[PDB]
Amino acid sequence: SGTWWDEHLSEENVPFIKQLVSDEDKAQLASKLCPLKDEPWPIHPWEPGSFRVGLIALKLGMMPLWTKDGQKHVVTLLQVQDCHVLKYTSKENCNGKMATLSVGGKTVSRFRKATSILEFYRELGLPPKQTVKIFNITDNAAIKPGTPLYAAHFRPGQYVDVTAKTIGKGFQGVMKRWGFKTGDIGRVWPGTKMPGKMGNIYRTEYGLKVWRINTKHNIIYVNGSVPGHKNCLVKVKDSKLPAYKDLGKNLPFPTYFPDGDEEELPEDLYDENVCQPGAPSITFA
Amino acid sequence: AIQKMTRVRVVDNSALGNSPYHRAPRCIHVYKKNGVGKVGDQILLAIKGQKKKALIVGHCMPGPRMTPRFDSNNVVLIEDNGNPVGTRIKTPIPTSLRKREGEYSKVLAIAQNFV
Amino acid sequence: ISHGRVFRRMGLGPESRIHLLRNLLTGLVRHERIEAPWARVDEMRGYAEKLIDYGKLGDTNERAMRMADFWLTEKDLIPKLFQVLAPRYKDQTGGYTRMLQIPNRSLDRAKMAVIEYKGNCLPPLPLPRRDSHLTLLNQLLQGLRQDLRQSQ
Amino acid sequence: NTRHIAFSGNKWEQKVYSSHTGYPGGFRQVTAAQLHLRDPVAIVKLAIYGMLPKNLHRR
Amino acid sequence: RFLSPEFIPRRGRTDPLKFQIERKDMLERRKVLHIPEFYVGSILRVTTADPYASGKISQFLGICIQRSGRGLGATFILRNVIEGQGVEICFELYNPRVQEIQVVKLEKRLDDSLLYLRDALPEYSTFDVNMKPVVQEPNQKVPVNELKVKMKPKPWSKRWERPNFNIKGIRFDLCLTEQQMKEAQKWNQPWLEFDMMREYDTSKIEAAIWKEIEASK
Amino acid sequence: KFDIDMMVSLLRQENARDICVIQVPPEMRYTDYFVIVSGTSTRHLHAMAFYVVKMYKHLKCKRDPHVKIEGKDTDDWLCVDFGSMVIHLMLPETREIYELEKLWTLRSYDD
RNA sequence: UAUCUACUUUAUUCCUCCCUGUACGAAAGGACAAGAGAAAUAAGGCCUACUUCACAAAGCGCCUUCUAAAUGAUAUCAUCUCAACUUAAUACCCACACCCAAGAACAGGGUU
Numbered sequence A: 001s002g003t004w005w006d007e008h009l010s011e012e013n014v015p016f017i018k019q020l021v022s023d024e025d026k027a028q029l030a031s032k033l034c035p036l037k038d039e040p041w042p043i044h045p046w047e048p049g050s051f052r053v054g055l056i057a058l059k060l061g062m063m064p065l066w067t068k069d070g071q072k073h074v075v076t077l078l079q080v081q082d083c084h085v086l087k088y089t090s091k092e093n094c095n096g097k098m099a100t101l102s103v104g105g106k107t108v109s110r111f112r113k114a115t116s117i118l119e120f121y122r123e124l125g126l127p128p129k130q131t132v133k134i135f136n137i138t139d140n141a142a143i144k145p146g147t148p149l150y151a152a153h154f155r156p157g158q159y160v161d162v163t164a165k166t167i168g169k170g171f172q173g174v175m176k177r178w179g180f181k182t183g184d185i186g187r188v189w190p191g192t193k194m195p196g197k198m199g200n201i202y203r204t205e206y207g208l209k210v211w212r213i214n215t216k217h218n219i220i221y222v223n224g225s226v227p228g229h230k231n232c233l234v235k236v237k238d239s240k241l242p243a244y245k246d247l248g249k250n251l252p253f254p255t256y257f258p259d260g261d262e263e264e265l266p267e268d269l270y271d272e273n274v275c276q277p278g279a280p281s282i283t284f285a
Numbered sequence B: 001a002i003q004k005m006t007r008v009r010v011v012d013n014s015a016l017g018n019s020p021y022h023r024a025p026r027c028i029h030v031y032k033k034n035g036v037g038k039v040g041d042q043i044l045l046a047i048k049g050q051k052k053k054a055l056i057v058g059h060c061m062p063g064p065r066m067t068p069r070f071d072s073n074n075v076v077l078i079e080d081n082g083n084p085v086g087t088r089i090k091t092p093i094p095t096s097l098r099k100r101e102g103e104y105s106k107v108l109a110i111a112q113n114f115v
Numbered sequence C: 001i002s003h004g005r006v007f008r009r010m011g012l013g014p015e016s017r018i019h020l021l022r023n024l025l026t027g028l029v030r031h032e033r034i035e036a037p038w039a040r041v042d043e044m045r046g047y048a049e050k051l052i053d054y055g056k057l058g059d060t061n062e063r064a065m066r067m068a069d070f071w072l073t074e075k076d077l078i079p080k081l082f083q084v085l086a087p088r089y090k091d092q093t094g095g096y097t098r099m100l101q102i103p104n105r106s107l108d109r110a111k112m113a114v115i116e117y118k119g120n121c122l123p124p125l126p127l128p129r130r131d132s133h134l135t136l137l138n139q140l141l142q143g144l145r146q147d148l149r150q151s152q
Numbered sequence D: 001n002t003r004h005i006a007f008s009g010n011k012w013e014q015k016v017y018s019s020h021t022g023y024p025g026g027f028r029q030v031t032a033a034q035l036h037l038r039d040p041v042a043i044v045k046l047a048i049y050g051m052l053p054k055n056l057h058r059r
Numbered sequence E: 001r002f003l004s005p006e007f008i009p010r011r012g013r014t015d016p017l018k019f020q021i022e023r024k025d026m027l028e029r030r031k032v033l034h035i036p037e038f039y040v041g042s043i044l045r046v047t048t049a050d051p052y053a054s055g056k057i058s059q060f061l062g063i064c065i066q067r068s069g070r071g072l073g074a075t076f077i078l079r080n081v082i083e084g085q086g087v088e089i090c091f092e093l094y095n096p097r098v099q100e101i102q103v104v105k106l107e108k109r110l111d112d113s114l115l116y117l118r119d120a121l122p123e124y125s126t127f128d129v130n131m132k133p134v135v136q137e138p139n140q141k142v143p144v145n146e147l148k149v150k151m152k153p154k155p156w157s158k159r160w161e162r163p164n165f166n167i168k169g170i171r172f173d174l175c176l177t178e179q180q181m182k183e184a185q186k187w188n189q190p191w192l193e194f195d196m197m198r199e200y201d202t203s204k205i206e207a208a209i210w211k212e213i214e215a216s217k
Numbered sequence F: 001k002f003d004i005d006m007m008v009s010l011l012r013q014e015n016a017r018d019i020c021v022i023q024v025p026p027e028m029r030y031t032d033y034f035v036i037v038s039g040t041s042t043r044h045l046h047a048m049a050f051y052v053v054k055m056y057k058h059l060k061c062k063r064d065p066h067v068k069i070e071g072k073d074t075d076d077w078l079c080v081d082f083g084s085m086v087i088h089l090m091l092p093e094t095r096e097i098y099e100l101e102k103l104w105t106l107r108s109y110d111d
Numbered sequence G: 001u002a003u004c005u006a007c008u009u010u011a012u013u014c015c016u017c018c019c020u021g022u023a024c025g026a027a028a029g030g031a032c033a034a035g036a037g038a039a040a041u042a043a044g045g046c047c048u049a050c051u052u053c054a055c056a057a058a059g060c061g062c063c064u065u066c067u068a069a070a071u072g073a074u075a076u077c078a079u080c081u082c083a084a085c086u087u088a089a090u091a092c093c094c095a096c097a098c099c100c101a102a103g104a105a106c107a108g109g110g111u112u
């Protein structure tokens, strides 16, 4: 037989285990709030040509955002929920071209994971995240594994690339999937467009302007549309577009640290062109 | 969207418009790559057996928000060189003609009203 | 693609699914316990609890009496819904029904279910009990609860 | 030392290695020099692989 | 109490925190600009800056004929005919180039959406541009104006006779035959009014939203 | 700056043949100043068009948008719009038939 | 009424504008490039609004789209040299039961 966690517990012991395990998840998330009062890794300044970490965010939904020129910009919200660095692998052990950081988001039940994963997070000292994405990264940006990543890792004005599974449409035919509808060739070429399973694949939207970040609720407000349904987990990295490869001067280079306590951030950073709520009604004079 | 074959309500003080005729004036060609015209496009137009260039001033399918939407396909005639046939335009004209690239300054001197 | 489509499509149309569910709900107000196939039962379970929430709006309410007049095809059950079922559940705010699975139907092997209304005169169902608090694992966890209470 | 091979004559510039990704329009002819800059094993590897008897013991 | 429809979410499996954020921005706009109570019958005049004129504003007056949209991006479209021409504008309620929204004549019509006014007589859609805002008294319910309008001939915008529209502001007796009426009662769906799983109860939603309103004060 | 005074400088400095401007009131949300000016011929109107866009372009106002001359191919009419003002270079016969000076003073009080 | 083979997720263009009415020409004439725009198509997404509609799916809607020189031998000059010398892919992906934005079945995600 196979079991589940709840199977042999009495009526008395089920909310006891809920309060116990939930409280250890809150304590483990609370202990990691001081990365710099811990012993971090050596923080380097930004060098031209270095890459830093990305994030994993919920897609909250969309809302409009008017700029000072009186144009709408549809904006997805992306909440950062319990994002943390999980493992650093150098380039020598990776046998890739570059070092890698594994980062995971959205705490998920301990009662529903493989035991290799629970041993991993147990040794690491964290409640297990839903997704773990991997970031190609230079040696200069390498935060210690077990450190929180926040919304202000990105700043307004920055352009960003977001990857998520697209909304799966299940098995679709040619007209919806591909949008249409030789003799001597006695066969159908590979990559021919035929009916099949549409969606539920990873796609990346490239070069999306960050308009506004909300430091309190940890929201990123990104231009336009991101792949995936609502409440989906997206991987938010800095854009690879070569028109945007050098603007890492002003971005906090390892990551943003509220523990650093230096010139703390407001409620919500806005881009310069954003009409804030509470500003007087804009006139084009 | 004013495509081919659409009936067109000409708003002018022109001789061609306000003349009575057995056929309603209807579009023939739209001067975009796709054959769909919006507020501030040029079309060919059949009036009294005479094809004639024309400029779309407001249509019935909704555009962006703060812009107006008419209950007819109001169209102002124009000549080949670019100056309009008309002298007065009675029905209101959207200000969205101002930003678009093309001949619009000539028409905005003629409007009685602006919406 | 049926994302967020919440209703089973049943019977031979929307009208016919509402008449199937209305017959099941009438059966369950009358007999207070029903075997029926499973998908039909949980569709109708949604409707059943709402029907009591209209029963608590009072006999004298006009809207409640319209809903009861539609949903109960036998008209003698409308005094029952406003004087037996709605006074029974006047304390608790939800959870008026319980649904379990029967073994599959002998005829065509359909997934079967029972719903009853809670607190009826009928012999009780063999409800799935949790394991006893005096078992080995439950006593280890009881001891652990005693230690974490001893922390204060 | 298979980076340090030595073709005789103009075989660096004339000899062509043609492959096909099975997709349409996926025919890829690449000279010996370009393929030797991609991977400095593949020229000796393709030579040997052509010399061996065309059967199942080959791989 | 009147809670404007843009605060009530449509049901859906989105996260309540997103509406916490939206309502925060919506109230922060309602500090600057005064958004009044108005229904789907009322005559409005809106002053907007123009993106095409250099900081000149404008006024449009008409009937709010629809209050669609929820959240910060919510709209209302008002209608008027001028110069023998019908015009409608979709106004975004929280677009920061609107300066004032004055309610000329607060009144509620029989329907929730007066889109049938596109097919009525143009006298039911025309209004004075310089008309004066009628004074309402502070402590009173709204005047529910009923006005069964008269309809222009049969090829309408939509078949308003059909009972999925539930149109009340029509004198159907003047402009429709009894045979076509009884034909229109084919698409009735009488059960649809009586199912209890389609009914979205916004009551506790209203509670948390009114504590959002009071807490922003 | 590039005001209407500077426009009078550009046109009397060109010796435009005929000048008549209207201050458009701010409600009629097209422009502020509505210049009606005629010249000799197509060469004259054309050259004074390129002159006034030459002087506005060369003068100041980098952040302000570059301005396209409208109706370069037509003969009688020409028109150029700025932020505050819009000039119409045309012919006095064309002025006679389009009667613009009546329109922007009589918005509903003419034919 | 599909048995077998094969197969079923490998950014362009137009117009405008500027640079510039400069370069070049001597006058007529008149650039490139790069930049900003607006469009359109294709590709990939998405639903905040609008529209068909309404716990969602859509488009008519929105978002994104990255051989030529010098030098110089044969043939002491020269000569672009089937003469020699010198010079001009990143991204993506990677660990029972119930509900599901996952789904034909199987699979997948969630169940604190």
Ligand SMILES: [Mg+2]
Residues within 6 Å of the ligand: A185, A186, A187
């Ligand atoms: Mg063959």
Ligand SMILES: [Mg+2]
Residues within 6 Å of the ligand: C010, C011
């Ligand atoms: Mg069936």
Ligand SMILES: [Mg+2]
Residues within 6 Å of the ligand: E157
């Ligand atoms: Mg229609």
